[PDB]
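Section handout, structural biology tutorial.
Before the tutorial, make sure you can parse a SMILES string by hand: atoms, branches in parentheses, ring closures as digits. In the record below the ligand is nonyl beta-D-glucopyranoside, and the chain has 189 residues. In the tutorial you will relate the predicted structure tokens back to the input. Do not try to memorize them.
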Amino acid sequence: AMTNNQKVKTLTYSAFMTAFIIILGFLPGIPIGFIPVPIILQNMGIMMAGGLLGPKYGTISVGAFLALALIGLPVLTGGNGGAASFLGPSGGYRIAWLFTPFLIGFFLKKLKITTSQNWFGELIIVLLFGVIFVDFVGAIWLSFQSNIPLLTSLISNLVFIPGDCIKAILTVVIVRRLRKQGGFELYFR
Ligand SMILES: CCCCCCCCCO[C@@H]1O[C@H](CO)[C@@H](O)[C@H](O)[C@H]1O
Ligand SMILES: CCCCCCCCCO[C@@H]1O[C@H](CO)[C@@H](O)[C@H](O)[C@H]1O
Ligand SMILES: CCCCCCCCCO[C@@H]1O[C@H](CO)[C@@H](O)[C@H](O)[C@H]1O
Ligand SMILES: O=C(O)CCCC[C@@H]1SC[C@@H]2NC(=O)N[C@@H]21
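Predicted structure of the complex:
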């Protein structure tokens, strides 16, 4: 049961995480040829949320970001948003983002990664849930909503892997540094 100081801290950090995800969206996306889904930076913030704030508050932070997009603020990459855009080609990735911080936070906590020097374990958890889970759900949704063969969608999504691996690596480096003091231990009890 948090103290007032802990709850003010949690509000501050959660608000920062939501704002950070939004700021990453100020970079324009890079269109690729073969599918109507760009390379972006914003999914990195989604990856970091669960490793900093754990499975509850990480999810709330991402949820708040997504809620802002759903009601119409242009907080997605390139100044996009609105509820209708969630039924579009990139909808699957976005829905997967809501679950990513829960999954990452849950396994970091359960495998005690946050209390160890096992940064490679952390990287694998981030890869599994922030990269593979996200890109797979995204690829399936894309196949259905753009009426393209599933095999084509899955293969085309390999284009995202190099950039997504870099994001996952930077995620582990950044979050482990932020955690080393003090300070985020509350979220992984
Ligand atoms: C710089 C571009 C605009 C940035 C907008 C930042 C929005 C920050 C909102 O975050 C949310 O605030 C809620 C209370 O307001 C918290 O309950 C919640 O945990 C947190 O996720
Ligand atoms: C905008 C939607 C916000 C949804 C809020 C997410 C609720 C977080 C649930 O807590 C988690 O429950 C798990 C099992 O129930 C525990 O294993 C874990 O330790 C705990 O952190
Ligand atoms: C002042 C700029 C930052 C916030 C200002 C309020 C903007 C609210 C509505 O914006 C609109 O959002 C749509 C998505 O819902 C976009 O499709 C559209 O291009 C954009 O015009
Ligand atoms: O703003 C949107 O509409 C969502 C775009 C989703 C892009 C996905 S996220 C995972 C993969 N890696 C990228 O760089 N882009 C795609």
